[PDB]
Amino acid sequence: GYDRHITIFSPEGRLYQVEYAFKATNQTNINSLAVRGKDCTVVISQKKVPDKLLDPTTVSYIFCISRTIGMVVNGPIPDARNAALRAKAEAAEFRYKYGYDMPCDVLAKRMANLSQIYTQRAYMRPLGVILTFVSVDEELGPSIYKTDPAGYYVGYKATATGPKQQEITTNLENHFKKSKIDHINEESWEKVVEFAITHMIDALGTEFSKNDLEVGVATKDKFFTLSAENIEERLVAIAEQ
Amino acid sequence: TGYDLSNSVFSPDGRNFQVEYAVKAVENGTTSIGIKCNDGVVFAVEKLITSKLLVPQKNVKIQVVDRHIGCVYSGLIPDGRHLVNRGREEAASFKKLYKTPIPIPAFADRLGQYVQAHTLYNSVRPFGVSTIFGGVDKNGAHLYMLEPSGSYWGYKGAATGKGRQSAKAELEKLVDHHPEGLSAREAVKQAAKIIYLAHEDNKEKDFELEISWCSLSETNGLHKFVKGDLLQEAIDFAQKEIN
Amino acid sequence: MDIILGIRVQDSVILASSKAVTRGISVLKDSDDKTRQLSPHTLMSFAGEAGDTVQFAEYIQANIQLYSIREDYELSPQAVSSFVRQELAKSIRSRRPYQVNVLIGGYDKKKNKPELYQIDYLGTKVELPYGAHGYSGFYTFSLLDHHYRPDMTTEEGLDLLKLCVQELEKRMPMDFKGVIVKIVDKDGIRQVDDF
Amino acid sequence: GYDRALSIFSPDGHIFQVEYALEAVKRGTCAVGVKGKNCVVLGCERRSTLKLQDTRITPSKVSKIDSHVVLSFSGLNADSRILIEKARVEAQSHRLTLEDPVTVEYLTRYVAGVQQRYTQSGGVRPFGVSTLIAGFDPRDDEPKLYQTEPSGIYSSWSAQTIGRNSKTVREFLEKNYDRKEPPATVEECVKLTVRSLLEVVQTGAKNIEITVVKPDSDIVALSSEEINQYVTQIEQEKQE
Amino acid sequence: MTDRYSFSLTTFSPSGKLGQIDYALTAVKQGVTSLGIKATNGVVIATEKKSSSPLAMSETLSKVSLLTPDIGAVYSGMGPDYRVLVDKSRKVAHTSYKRIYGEYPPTKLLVSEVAKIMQEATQSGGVRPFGVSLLIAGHDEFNGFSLYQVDPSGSYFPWKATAIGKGSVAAKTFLEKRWNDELELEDAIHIALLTLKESVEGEFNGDTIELAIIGDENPDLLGYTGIPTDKGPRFRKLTSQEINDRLEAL
Amino acid sequence: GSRRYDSRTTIFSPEGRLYQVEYALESISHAGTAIGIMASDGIVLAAERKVTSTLLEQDTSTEKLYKLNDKIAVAVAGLTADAEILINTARIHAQNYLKTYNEDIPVEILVRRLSDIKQGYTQHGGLRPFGVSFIYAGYDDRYGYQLYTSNPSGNYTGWKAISVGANTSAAQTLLQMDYKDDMKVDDAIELALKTLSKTTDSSALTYDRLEFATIRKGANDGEVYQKIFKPQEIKDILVKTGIT
Amino acid sequence: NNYDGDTVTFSPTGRLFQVEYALEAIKQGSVTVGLRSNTHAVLVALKRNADELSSYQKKIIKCDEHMGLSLAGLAPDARVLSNYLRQQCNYSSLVFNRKLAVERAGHLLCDKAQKNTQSYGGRPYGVGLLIIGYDKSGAHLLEFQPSGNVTELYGTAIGARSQGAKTYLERTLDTFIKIDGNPDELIKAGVEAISQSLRDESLTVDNLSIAIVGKDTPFTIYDGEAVAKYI
Amino acid sequence: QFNPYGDNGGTILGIAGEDFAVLAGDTRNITDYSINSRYEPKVFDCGDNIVMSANGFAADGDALVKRFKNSVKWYHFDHNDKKLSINSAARNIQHLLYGKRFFPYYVHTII
Amino acid sequence: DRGVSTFSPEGRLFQVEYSLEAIKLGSTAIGIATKEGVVLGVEKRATSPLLESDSIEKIVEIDRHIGCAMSGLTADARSMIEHARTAAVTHNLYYDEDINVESLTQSVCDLALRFGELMSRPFGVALLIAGHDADDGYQLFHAEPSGTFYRYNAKAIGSGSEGAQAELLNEWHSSLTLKEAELLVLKILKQVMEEKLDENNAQLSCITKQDGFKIYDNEKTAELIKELKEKEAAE
Ligand SMILES: [Cl-]
C-alpha cells in the first residue's frame, strides 16, 4: 500500500499523507485562539515550557511576518519556522513587486497554494502545520485567515486551533450567538486581549500565570507580541473583576 | 506499515520515523554540553580514547564558525562537519552582504532551516547529530541546541549524547543555585566537572576532555579553545569533585 | 565563384556556371563545377563566399537525398526550392550567415514542366524564365529580355546561352574561364561537354 | 530526466531486459537472408490474420537504407523505424564526410552500436528488434549479409533467418546451403529463399515478400505473380 | 534532492483502468453538489456553500469564480485543487489568447486549455491528477452561450444542463424533467434553486447558496465609459439579497 | 529514494510484450467503436459516441472525429484528453511541412510521425503511453485515398476497411464479408452504419449517438472536400438506409 | 535487513548499513600498517596477487612530495580519493605556494566521503586509507574510514588481521615514537608490526611494499629488490 | 580601455652542444623606461633535466612556466614516474600555448 | 528492486559481482607473455555452421604496440576499444610518443565504475590487454568491470578459464620462446573448447617490438595446429 506513503489518491479518493500531516499539527499539545475587535485582531496561544534548562524567551509559536501581519502556528517548530521564513520572504517580495503591503488574506492564499502543491507533487511532503494569519487590513479591517496541510484556507470571525479546539470553538460560537455581532465590541485592544484570555480560561477550564500564555496583537500599521509583564498586567485586570 | 522505510513520510501518528531513527544515532554518540554564563558561553565534549595510539590533543572535535561562534555535536561526526561547513558558508554570505558578523539567533535559524530541509524529501537522509552551539553578539550571549528534526531552542544549559540525562541533572542544579549568573571562568570549571560526571555512562574506555569558550571580558567576544594552565586547572577541579 | 546563369525553355532548364576559382591574384582552377545534383531531376548551381558555397550546397544535397530515401519519392522542384529558401531565411539571422546565392533548375515530372528558381543569400525566392546572380545579370537580363521566347527548344536555348557567354566574355572585367553547361529535362540531368 | 537503470545484471549474470527483447524478436514474423554467387535475397513472412490490408501503403518489411544497402527485421515494428531512420541519416552523413557510400559492414556496425547503447543507458529499454542487413560495397561485386540483435552483437552470414519458427528454417538452410557452391544465379537464390519460407509460412500467396539486391545499386522487389511462379514450381517437384 | 519523480504516477492496470483518475472521480463524488443550466439567453451555475465552522466567514470563500468577463466556473471535489486551477485558467486566457488576439477566448477553447492542464497531471512525472470536476459556463460572439463539464481525466463535454458531486444522480434526473429548449434565464435560475434544495440539508438561503449567471452585458459593472464597443461583463454573481428575493416565489 | 514508487512503464514482460501498451489496448477495447471504409471515390468515417445522456449538447460537440488539415481527418478511440494532445501535435506537424515545402503533407508522413511519438513513450521517459488508437482518413496526389490505424505501441498499418475500439473482432468479420474493391462512397456509408448497428452494445442506433464524416472528391473538379456531418444530416442518412 | 537498500536510510537503532557494508570491504582487504616517529612517517603494506602468474596489487600511492597513502579495500575507490588528494595538495601549492597540511588533507577526505552517505543514488567509498606526511608541524599519520571518520594516530593498521599489528604497535608505542633521525629502524618496526598479521604466508621480495616520508626525505615507495634489505 | 598585455623586456638565449645545453637570460625586469628589478630570474629548472624560459610579458611567462612545471608533476603521477623527454615536453608546451590561440600567452618560449 | 551501486553485506557491489558471472559464460581467451613477445588467442565459437567465422572479431588492435582480446558480452567491448584507441592516439598527439601499456589499461579501467544512477550498468566483458613499451617491455593485463587490472605472465578468461589457468600455472616459465607460447595457447584452447579446434574456430595473434601487433592468417595458424598435433604424438 504505497498510496499511503506519497500524495497519490487511495481507492476511496483520499490523501493519507495529508491526513497524517493534520495529526502532526497537534504534536505540540498547544491550543491557539484568535478574535477580532473594532480596531484590532488579537491572537493568543498557550506557552508550555517543560524543561527548566530552556530559555523561555526563545520558545515561541507566534511570528511577526511583516510590520502589519502576524502568524501563529499549530504544529512542530521546524515546519513552523519553515513556513514563517517563506511567509516573510513572500510578503517582502510582494511589497517590492507591487508597491503596497501584502494583505493578510492574499498571503494566506499564497501559502495555501504552496501547501496545495505539496499535496499534488510527490517529491515534496506537506508541512505538519496549521497557520493562522492576523492583521488589521487597510481595506478589509480586522482579519483572521487560516491555512492547513490540505491547502484549504478561509476567513474567520474568530477561530481556534489545537487538541482542545472544539471546546474553544463552541465557547466562541455561543458568545457570538449571544452578542449578535461579528466581533468583540470593545475600544481598546487591552480589553480584547482580556476577552480572549477569559474565554480561553472558561473553555479549557485552566488558570494561567504570566508564563503560560503568549499574546499577539494586530493594530493599524503594526503587529506586536506582548511581554510577560504586559500579560501579567492583563491577568491582574481580569482577576480584579 | 513500511512508514519508517522512507524519509519525509508521515506515519499515521504524524511522525517522521526516519528522523526519530537519526535521534538514536545521536543517543549512541559521546557526551557534549554547553553552559551559558554572565557574558558568554562555554562548550565541552567527551573524547573516548579508543586506543593508546590516538595522539592526545590532536583529534579536535569542537569547531569554530566565523570568529565568534563555537559548535560541538554528538552522533555521526562527519554529519556534524557537513553542518558546520554549511554554517560557515551561511555566516560568510551574511557578513558579505550585511558587513556585521552573523548574530547567534540568525545563525541558529540558518542551521535550523538547512537541517529541516533534510526532512522534506526521500532522496536525502536526516542529520545524525544534535548540535550545541552559540557565541557572543551585539545583544550578549546565546546558547542553542539543534536536533535532527530541525528543532532548536535557546538554552541556559544544554546537553546531548550517551550521558545527556546525567549532564542535564547537573546543569539544572547550577541554574537553581546561581539565579544571578555564573562567571565564564566558573563555567569552564563546571563544564569539566559535568563531562567527568557524565562519563559514568561511558566508563569502559577512559576519555580526553576538550573545552572552548566565548566571553565578552575573558576572550574579547571571540571563540577560543581552553588550553594549558586553564585546562589543567579545570581538569583538577573536576577530579576533586568525583572523589 | 561569380557567374551563374539559368534559362528555362519549352521542355528543359539550362544552367551555365563559370569554371574559374580565383583567390587573390591567382586563378587556382579553371575547371570547377559550381553545381550539385539534389535529386535525379533537380540541379542547383551556387555562387558566393568561399567555403560557404560548397558547404551549403552539400548540406542541402544531403537533406534532399535523405528525404528521397525515407519516402522512396522525389520532391518536386517547387518543394525543394521552398526548403532551400527557408534554410537561407534562417541563416540570414544566424550568428554567421551563409553568404551563398543559388539557382535551382528542375523538371517537375508530375506537371511535365521545366522550372527555374532564383534564390539569394537573404532567402529571396522567385520563379523565372531566365535568371542570373551577381554582376552577370546586368548584361544578360536585357539581352534575354530581347532574344528569349517561351517556346524555344533546348538547342535554341543553348544558342541563346552562347550569346550570353559571348557578351560576358566581351564586357566583363574578369576572366571566368568559360562555363560548364547542364540540361535538366524529363530524362534527368546531363552535361554538355563541348561549349 | 528519467534516469532509471532498466537493463541491469541479475545474480546469474543475465540482463533480462535484453533477453526479453529477444522474445519480442521471436514473436515477430519470419525473415530470411540468402546470398548467392552474385546477389543477396531477402525473404519475409507476412501473417495472414490481416485481410482487408492495403499493400500499396502498408510499410514494407524490407527497407532501403541507401541505394545499395537494404535492411529487413523481426520484432517490434515501431522500434524498427527508429533504427532505420538513424541508419539512413548515417548513410547520408557518411557520403558527406568520406565522399563514398557506406560499406555494408560499416552500416551494420553503426546499427548494432545504437542497439548496444540502449542496453546500458539509463531511462531506456533495449530495441525489440533483430535485423538482417544486406547489400554490396561501393565498386564491389561480392555479396554481403549481416545480422544484428538487441544485445548489440553482429556478424556475417552465408544465409540466416530470424523471427518466429526461424529455428525450423535455419535447419532447412543448414542442410540445403552449400558453402562450396552458393546459388549460382538470381533464380537459384530466390528459389532456395522461397523454399525455406515454405517450410514455415502456410500459403505462398500474399504471405511471402522477396527483394533481390544485385551489385551497383540494383535493387528490385518481386510482385505476387513472380513469387507465385516459384511457389507453383516448387510444389510440382515436391510431389515425387 | 530535486524532483526524482520523473515517472508517471498514473498507469494502466491489467483491466485497462487508470487508477488515479478513477480515484479522483471518487473524490468528486464525495464533493458537495454543484450544477449548471443553459437557457436561451443565458447560463446559470450554482452550488451549496458548505461552511466549515459557523465562526468562518463563507463570503471570503468563493466557490464560483470569474475566469474572463464572459466566463465563470464552479466545481465539485477538492477546493484547493480548484483554487489553483482558477489561477492557472485565468492566466492561460491571457498568455495563450488575449496577448495574441487582443480579445478573450471563446468558452470552448478556454475549456480546452483547462482540460489540457488537467490531462498533463494525468501523464506527467511525479504528480497526481486534480481531484475536481469543473462546470464552466460562458458566452462568446460566434458560439453564443455554452456550458461545459471538465473531468479529472481532461475530458470535456458540452451540456444543456447537468450536475456533479454528492447528489448528482438525482439532480440530473430532476433536470431532465424540467429542461426544455425554450427556457428563459429567469426560468433556469428558478429550476437551479429547486434542484439544489433537494441536495441541501441544513439552511437554504442566500448566505448558504452561491449562484452566478452568464447573461446580458452589464455596463454598470464595467467601471468606465466612452468606448462604445466595450459594453461590460456578461458574468455576474448574484448577491445574497438577490437569492432570497427568488426564494419567496419558489 | 523514489525508486520504490516507479511502475516502470517502459519494460518487457518475460514473454516479450510491453505491459503498458497491452493494458492501454485493453482500455481502448471499452471505448466506442469507430469504423473507416475506403471506397474508390472517397472515404467514410463512422464512430459511436460513448453512452450519451439526453441533456448532452449534441451539435456543438466533438468526441470522436477531428480535422487535422483540409485533406486529413481522424477517428478516435480511447481517452479523449490524450487524443487532443496528439491531434494538436499532428496539426502543427502538417503546418510545418506546408511551411517548409509549400505542399500539403502526404498522409503517410503525418501518420508515421504521430506513430513515432507514441513509440517514444514506450521506449524511454518512464511515462505512461497514450491510451489512444486513431483511424486516419486522408487524400494526397501520390496514393489518392488512404486509411491508416495507429495504436499505443506506435505501430501503424494501411487498410481498405478497419474498425477500432469496442467489438472490433465482430466488426471486422462483418466488413470482411460485405466489402468489395469497386465499392462507391454511398455504398460504404451504408456498410459503415450497418456494421455499427449490428455490433453496438446499445439497444438501437440513433442519430444522437453517432459522429459521421466523408472525404470525397465530390467537390468541383480534381479537389477534395471534408464533410463532418451535422446532427440532422446523420438523422437523414440513418433514415435513407432504413436503420430508423 | 529492510534498511540496507541504500545509504540514505537509517535503521531503527540509528545505523547506516551501506556504510557498514563498505566498512566490511576494508576488512577483506590485505593488511597495511602505518606508524611514525617525530622525524619520519612510514607505511608498510602486504600486497595480494590473483595467482602465481599475476602481479601483486599495488597498495601505496604518492599524493605530493610530502604526502601519500596506503589502501585496503576497493582499489578503484582509492584511485579516485588519491586523485582528489593530489588535486587538493596541488591547488594549495599553485594558489598559496603552501604545502597542504596533513590535517587539512584529512578534513577534505572526511567531507568528500560524507557527501556520498547522505544522498540518494550514490554509494559510500569501499576503501580505507592510511595517510602519512611531513609538514610544518612535523610527521603525521592519519586513518581514513569511508564512514567519513578520519583519525590522527602515532601508529595503526587496517585490513584482514590488522588487530595483530595494532596490538603490537600499542605495546611498542614508547619505543618507536622515539626513533628519530633513523629511517631503517622505523621501517624495521613497521615490518615487525605487519608480521603480526601474517598467517601461512611470509614476507617475500615481490610481496612487501614500504613507503617513507620525513624531515629530509620526500615521499618515496620501495618495491622489489629494494625491500630485500628488510626480510 | 584596459590593455591586458605589457612588455617586461629582457632577452634570452639557448645553445646546444654535443652532450650539454645552456639556457641563458638576463635578470633585468622593466616596464616602459623604469627598472622593476635588477635581479628577477626568468630561466627555471622544471625537473627531468628540462630548463625553460618564457620571455616577453612576465605575467604570461610565469603562468606558462607554472603550468608546465605542474604538467611535469602530473606526467609522473599518471605514467609511473616516467621521465618526460625533451621532445615530449616540447609537444606538451605546444598544446599549452595553442590552447590559448585566441587570447595568447605573449611570450617567446625556449626550452 | 534496489540501487545499482548497492553494497552486499559482505562488502561487494552486486552489479559488479553479477557481471563477473556473465564473463564466465563468454568464450575462452588466453594470453601468454614472453621476452620475445605476447601471444593472444581466442575461441571464436560460432553459434551455427552458416555463420562466416572470419567475421567474428574477438582480437582487436588498439595501437601498433597494443592489442586486445575479449570475453563475455562482446558488444560491450566496442566503446571500451573506441576509448582505448582514442586514449592511445590522443596521448601520441599530446606527447609525440607511444603511451605506456599500463597507462592505457588504467585509462580503460577508469570507465569501469562510471555506472550508477554515467552508464546504467557495468560492462559485461573482460579484456586481455597485451602490448610493449620501452620502460617495462612486454606486458599482459587483465582488465575487469570492477575497475581493477592485474598484470599477468599468463592468463585465461571465459568459460574454460579456471581449468586453463591451472594448466598455464604448470606450463609457464620465464624463458618461453614466442613459438613455444603460440603452441601453448593452441594446446590449452583445444583442451577447454567444446568443438574440435581448427583454423576456423580459433584465432591467434601476437605483439612484438619489431613488427607490432599482428593477427595471424588462417593459413599460418593451421600450420601451427599441425605442428602441435605432430609434437604431442612424438612422445
Ligand atoms: Cl500562488
Side-chain angles (χ1 to χ4, degrees), chain I residues 76 92 103 126 138 160 175 201 205 223:
Chain I
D76 286 16
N92 177 248
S103 297
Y138 295 108
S175 307
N201 60 15
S205 73
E223 295 182 47

Side-chain angles (χ1 to χ4, degrees), chain D residues 109-142:
Chain D
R109 167 157 39 95
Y110 172 79
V111 171
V114 172
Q115 284 179 285
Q116 194 284 138
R117 213 188 309 123
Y118 280 61
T119 69
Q120 63 180 336
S121 296
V124 305
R125 61 158 181 80
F127 286 98
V129 175
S130 291
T131 68
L132 294 169
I133 298 165
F136 289 86
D137 295 357
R139 307 170 303 282
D140 190 41
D141 51 11
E142 194 195 316

Side-chain angles (χ1 to χ4, degrees), chain A residues 109-111 113-114 117, chain E residues 84 87:
Chain A
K109 186 193 174 171
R110 171 58 180 165
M111 294 300 296
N113 281 162
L114 265 22
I117 289 168
Chain E
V84 302
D87 290 337

